[PDB]
Ligand SMILES: *[C@@H]1O[C@H](CO)[C@@H](O)[C@H](O)[C@H]1NC(C)=O
């Protein structure tokens with residue numbers, strides 16, 4: 001509706017008998033393949049991303065925001081738990097890091 | 107000629123012009139749109155088509171209506187079966203109703 005891409009903002013300019021909109025959009029540019037999974041199995045519990053998507057660089061699993069590659073360690077602040085690891089099709093095992101474990105150990 | 111009104115129309119200077127796009131081309135467009143949707147979700151509408159597994163795209167949609175994605179994943183076969191049945195009903199209705 002406001003240009004091609006994800007609309008950011010628009011600026012109007014007057015023209016004879018009409019109007020010209022300068023639409024500013026965000027266009028994703030340089031995509032890279034990744035291996036992905038719907039959920040992560042850690043301790044017999046299925047984990048799902050709170051905001052992003054699980055991606056593998058080939059050996060290591062990260063969670064990233066969906067529209068810009070920004071890989072982050074998979075932690076319990078990153079994810080939420082729902083159910084065991086038996087229903088989800090395509091679940092993979094990986095560790096889900098607990099931020100409070102080192103603090104309790106320290 | 108008498109058994110055809112088109113002949114009278116043509117004989118009195120009234121003609122029908124063919125569309126620029128043939129039916130085959132329009133079907134090509136629809137199939138391109140369908141392939142883009144089922145392989146990349148909404149990404150091909152904004153930029154390059156970014157492939158994504160279809161179940162994960164469905165999880166994105168469920169998030170888009172305020173349902174957590176585990177609801178999609180834990181009922182994935184139920185949801186797929188409901189969709190398949192609904193498509194079948196569309197088929198049967200088209201095969202039954204002529205207007
Ligand atoms: C992803 O891998 C496929 C497999 O051949 C390839 O065709 C495609 O171009 C790759 N895309 C990117 C962005 O690397």
Ligand SMILES: *[C@@H]1O[C@H](CO)[C@@H](O)[C@H](O)[C@H]1NC(C)=O
Nearest residue numbers: 041042044085091092093094
């Ligand atoms: C993931 O872990 C489960 C639980 O131990 C195991 O049964 C399964 O084989 C593992 N999957 C892979 C691909 O290693």
